[PDB]
Design a binder for these strands. Structure first.
Ligand SMILES: [Mg+2]
Ligand SMILES: [Mg+2]
Ligand SMILES: [Mg+2]
Ligand SMILES: [Mg+2]
Ligand SMILES: [Mg+2]
Ligand SMILES: [Mg+2]
Ligand SMILES: [Mg+2]
Ligand SMILES: [Mg+2]
Ligand SMILES: [Mg+2]
Ligand SMILES: [Mg+2]
Ligand SMILES: [Mg+2]
Ligand SMILES: [Mg+2]
Ligand SMILES: [Mg+2]
Ligand SMILES: [Mg+2]
Ligand SMILES: [Mg+2]
Ligand SMILES: [Mg+2]
Ligand SMILES: [Mg+2]
Ligand SMILES: [Mg+2]
Ligand SMILES: [Mg+2]
Ligand SMILES: [Mg+2]
Ligand SMILES: [Mg+2]
Ligand SMILES: [Mg+2]
Ligand SMILES: [Mg+2]
Ligand SMILES: [Mg+2]
Ligand SMILES: [Mg+2]
Ligand SMILES: [Mg+2]
Ligand SMILES: [Mg+2]
Ligand SMILES: [Mg+2]
Ligand SMILES: [Mg+2]
Ligand SMILES: [Mg+2]
Ligand SMILES: [Mg+2]
Ligand SMILES: [Mg+2]
Ligand SMILES: [Mg+2]
Ligand SMILES: [Mg+2]
Ligand SMILES: [Mg+2]
Ligand SMILES: [Mg+2]
Lengths: 129, 155, 151, 144
RNA sequence: GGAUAGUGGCCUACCAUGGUUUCAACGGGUAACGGGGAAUAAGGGUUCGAUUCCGGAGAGGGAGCCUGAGAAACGGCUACCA
RNA sequence: CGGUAAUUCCAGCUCCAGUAGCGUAUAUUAAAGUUGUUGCAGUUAAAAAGCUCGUAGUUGAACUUUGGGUCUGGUUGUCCGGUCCGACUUUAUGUCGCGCACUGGUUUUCAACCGGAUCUUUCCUUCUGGCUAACCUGUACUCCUUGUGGGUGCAGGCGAACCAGGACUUUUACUUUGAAAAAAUUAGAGUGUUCAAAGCAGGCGAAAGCUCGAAUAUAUUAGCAUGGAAUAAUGGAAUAGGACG
RNA sequence: AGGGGAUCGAAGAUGAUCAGAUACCGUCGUAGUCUUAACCAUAAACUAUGCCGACUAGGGAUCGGGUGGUGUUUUUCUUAUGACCCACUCGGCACCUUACGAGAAAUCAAAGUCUUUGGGUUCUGGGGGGAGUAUGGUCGCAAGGCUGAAACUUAAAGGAAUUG
RNA sequence: GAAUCUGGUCAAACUUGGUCAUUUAGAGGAACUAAAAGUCGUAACAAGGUUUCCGUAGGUGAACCUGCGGAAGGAUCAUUA
RNA sequence: CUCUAACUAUAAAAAUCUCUCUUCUC
């Protein structure tokens, strides 16, 4: 029973990236996955991906450009305050210089710096670096 | 409720210090004082033309509503002329960054002007100390059925 | 590949094609298909049987793709849906067969194992069909209401 | 993996899991059960007075052979009886059978130490004065 | 209805059969007065809080009390047990 | 360690760390990723109920308005206008410099990033009345250079600029901000308690009264208002017992 | 409790061997071994690997099934079958190489995707003994199971692995 | 308007026995630790000289053996010889 | 880039042990 679709998506992404596969197949292909991936690409950590339709949830084919080292989800979407996000930084980001913990807020799925400069905090999704 | 001719017990039931005039050439059955609680609540129709007494009714009775307002789910209707509302909510224990679905059950008072089934969703309000269990009192039932407003299939 | 009542891990299934619209070659129209469907239903045939017959004896690939709607819902439209869905009904029938076996002979304790498994399936479907307002919630199931309804 | 529930309202099982599994640690069990008060004659407090009843010499463990000089002591605040060893060269003559002695633990947290069998305590003061001062002759026993 | 400064099974009288529970009731234990806080410290946190501030509680153990706005008072009483 | 050469016993002498403090014992925390939410191990070391069904709890498939076009308030850095600063020493400038050390226009193209209005088949609840804010108003058309540079005016008529009698009302959890968290402690503003622990004082006169203060955040659990509508849960209209006119 | 009652075979009767053998060796020979009803609930009920998920590496082969062969023998002059060979796959027990990872290693294609710590999941253990013991329940006709300590006591017990 | 005193009334408290918690002796009964030059054998580690170990049941100075079922933690990963 | 065949068979007894355990630097 596929429970957290984005979790499986990024798990496959990370597996292939470690293996070196320049591309990945994601089965569920939900909105959350999609938005996570535009954040992924806009930060410059991934190339051009594609969506397939099935009349059932579609499919995802993401082109790996090697710049990724890991994705990663926080499947318990822990409830975070505006101040607390920084701690998540120091616990998931490889350094404060870069690295982006992705969180979903009322505004939407965003990078943590996007949220901070918007001064808005929602719930946590995952991380990229 | 009071079930079919309220005037049943060993004493009469009359809204206190309202005088039913025998000297009026009217034959108007009785004078039923009534009032709206407020806060955007609408007094239901069956209260104005009713015959019951319910001294503890917010509308036709003596009690005055003031203070807290809550929403809850009917859990038990067996008790006479009163009700019990379960309230399920989440509790953030700080040690684990988690919420906690626990329940608190509270008794309230229902006027005969209302029809209540188990599992109904009811807005309830605060009032005077009515009984050692009852300190709240119902206002109105929104989800009268939940999903059972349609039951037959005759196209 | 969940397969509660065993360790099965088989994905053997059937995959619908892409076109929700009818194929080009087909000649019949929706209304005639509906009339064929309702006549088949009045024969006393369960909806899955009728779907199979439509697929085989005709170019009726999908009830929904051709007539815009599925079999059970159409059979509800003309007020002719049976009281129990074919699924639960067939499960109850198999349960009755198991029950008659176990009443005939006793030492089939492994058949008692199958009995508990199956009746668990009935309990699952009963909860589901009580939540979704198909059966009235008053309905229960022990042994004998099955004997009356099925037989 | 990680067969401990993770859901956003899924730690009744987790909190109770800790809540029950605490008992695995012995220190937690001792602290919660008050074992330092009911059992363990030395009432969990760092010191207690007692009366010397008899003197004994007891051998060491295997890799040693040295008969230490210990004393049977009855603790006044319970009357319970226990051994206690007297550390120094010239101390046995300082016991003065039927005397009041102030005793502490032997610094191993309720266990034997080194090459001493069945003993748990130290002899830190004798007859009001402290035996350590007597050892280096800083004060003298009044001999009351 | 009584009673209370006043609600309320507070108490009574006539009835009705109910209330709480595995979301931890009730019972047992607490060398537990609750808190503000203290210690400890990447972060998360663990333990202590008899004790300067807040409340609440007691004046040997229970009870009963007049007076007084305010007492069930104890450097105020009435009684028993010690 | 010690059983005839003791680097440990016990003294003496050399010393090392501690220092008016230091050593013992009993409890406690960190070390402890040895309670593991963050963050444990479970083929063999400790340990997967024999297996299976299954209540409660827990976990739950994907799916329902997204893009432009335009305009703007901006807050940042982009040319700098002036103000002017360092090379030049008792005093000052042309010149070289940090290419503005202090202040704007932002169409300097620039990039943003926060909203706001908007055209979307694009609702942001809307009436019943104020009050009309205001100008499509439209009445005299005019103070006036033909010229919309500029306005008093009074029935239709923009309400959203704010008011008020309802009637409506999907609700959540969440989240932002604000309101409450006495004090004391905590954090830290200032302040020569002789420094400092502190404490909440003091500083300036000319000693002729004149002044500074006693700064600021935190507390998340319950509750209240609040901007948001992504996350996740929930309701529809199926016998139309449905929506509008 | 009841039906069976061959063989085998705990008790036991016995003859060897040894200083000792009511141990192993060989004879006999009950319970029990087959079972009908009723209990029994444990076993080294071990792959000493919980389940449900997705993804990662090559290789044959093997079972059940299905796909396509101008495939081949079959022969029913003939097709149809079947039975075989080829090619692909679905699912199942497994296997071979490898380390690409990961482990205390032994190894494992999962014991991986685990400090770059987070798919969802129920149950377990916190040094060794004392001890699966005491105790109180609980189930049981009983043998016994599920549940389940503490005092006390010790600095190791122990796992893999090294060369002797 | 005191004494006395009708009623009830809160009811402390006393007797009486029941019932329970905790300490508490205790004839006697049954164990475990540490003490390692006590005694008897040698169960185990190798094929421990009968492979070990486990569950079950009987017996057995003691170890343990025995019968039945298991497992490799074994000493076999191996017969298309 | 042509091969599918041979093969054997002992088990007699062995029971045990109180020692010291000692140190690595330019
Ligand atoms: Mg209690
Ligand atoms: Mg406390
Ligand atoms: Mg206190
Ligand atoms: Mg106080
Ligand atoms: Mg007074
Ligand atoms: Mg008093
Ligand atoms: Mg008082
Ligand atoms: Mg006093
Ligand atoms: Mg007095
Ligand atoms: Mg010497
Ligand atoms: Mg010395
Ligand atoms: Mg550990
Ligand atoms: Mg083990
Ligand atoms: Mg196991
Ligand atoms: Mg198992
Ligand atoms: Mg459930
Ligand atoms: Mg979902
Ligand atoms: Mg405060
Ligand atoms: Mg301070
Ligand atoms: Mg028999
Ligand atoms: Mg025989
Ligand atoms: Mg013999
Ligand atoms: Mg022998
Ligand atoms: Mg024999
Ligand atoms: Mg024999
Ligand atoms: Mg077992
Ligand atoms: Mg199988
Ligand atoms: Mg232990
Ligand atoms: Mg053990
Ligand atoms: Mg038992
Ligand atoms: Mg009286
Ligand atoms: Mg001997
Ligand atoms: Mg032997
Ligand atoms: Mg032998
Ligand atoms: Mg053996
Ligand atoms: Mg030997």
């Amino acid at each position: 029973t596929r429970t957290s679709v984005l979790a499986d998506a990024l798990n496959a992404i990370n597996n292939a990236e470690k293996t070196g596969k320049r591309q990945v197949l994601i089965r569920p292909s939900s909105k959350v996955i999609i938005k996570f991936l535009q954040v992924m690409q806009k930060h410059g950590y991934i190339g051009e991906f594609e969506y397939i339709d099935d009349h059932r949830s579609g499919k995802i084919v993401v082109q790996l450009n090697g710049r990724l080292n890991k994705c990663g989800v926080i499947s318990p979407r822990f409830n975070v305050k505006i101040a607390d996000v920084e701690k998540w930084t120091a616990n998931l980001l490889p350094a404060r210089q870069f690295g982006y913990v992705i969180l979903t807020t009322s505004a939407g799925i965003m990078d943590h710096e996007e949220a901070h400069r918007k001064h808005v905090s929602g719930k946590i999704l995952g991380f990229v670096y | 409720s009071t079930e079919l001719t309220v005037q049943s017990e060993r004493a009469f039931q009359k809204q206190p210090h309202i005088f039913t005039n025998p000297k009026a050439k009217a034959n108007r059955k009785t004078k039923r004082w009534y009032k709206n609680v407020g806060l955007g609540f609408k007094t239901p129709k069956t209260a104005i033309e009713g015959s019951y007494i319910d001294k503890k009714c917010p509308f036709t009775g003596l009690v005055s509503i003031r203070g807290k307002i809550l929403t809850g789910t009917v859990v038990s209707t067996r008790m006479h002329r009163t009700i019990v509302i379960r309230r399920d909510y989440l509790h953030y224990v700080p040690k684990y960054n988690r919420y906690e679905k626990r329940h608190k059950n509270v008794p309230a008072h229902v006027s005969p002007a209302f029809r209540v089934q188990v599992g109904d969703i009811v807005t309830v309000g605060q009032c005077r100390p009515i009984s050692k269990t009852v300190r709240f009192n119902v206002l109105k039932v929104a989800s009268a059925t939940g999903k059972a407003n349609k039951q037959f299939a005759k196209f | 590949m969940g397969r509660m009542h065993s360790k099965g891990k088989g994905m053997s299934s059937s995959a619908i094609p892409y076109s929700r619209n009818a194929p080009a070659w087909f000649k019949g129209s929706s209304d005639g298909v509906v009339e064929q469907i309702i006549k088949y239903a009045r024969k006393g045939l369960t909806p899955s049987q009728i779907g199979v017959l439509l697929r085989d004896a005709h170019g009726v690939t999908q009830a929904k793709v051709i007539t815009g709607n599925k079999i059970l819902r159409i059979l509800k439209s003309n007020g002719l849906a049976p009281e129990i869905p074919e699924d639960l009904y067939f499960l109850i029938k198999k349960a009755v067969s198991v029950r008659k076996h176990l009443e005939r002979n006793r030492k089939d304790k492994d058949a008692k194992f199958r009995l508990i498994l199956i009746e668990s399936r009935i309990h699952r479907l009963a909860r589901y069909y009580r939540t979704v307002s198909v059966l009235p919630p008053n309905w229960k199931y022990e042994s004998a209401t099955a004997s009356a309804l099925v037989n | 993996g990680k067969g401990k529930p993770r859901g956003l309202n899924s730690a009744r099982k987790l909190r109770v899991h800790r809540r029950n599994n605490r008992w695995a640690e012995t220190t937690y069990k001792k602290r919660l059960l008050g074992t330092a008060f009911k059992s363990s004659p030395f009432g969990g407090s760092s010191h207690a007075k007692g009366i010397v009843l008899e003197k004994i010499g007891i051998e060491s463990k295997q890799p040693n052979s040295a008969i230490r000089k210990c004393v049977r002591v009855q603790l006044i605040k319970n009357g319970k009886k226990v051994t206690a060893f007297v550390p120094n060269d010239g101390c046995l003559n300082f016991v003065d059978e039927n005397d009041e002695v102030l005793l502490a633990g032997f610094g191993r947290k309720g266990k034997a130490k080194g090459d001493i069998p069945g003993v748990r305590f130290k002899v830190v003061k004798v007859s009001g004065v402290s035996l350590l001062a007597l050892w280096k002759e800083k004060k003298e026993k009044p001999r009351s």
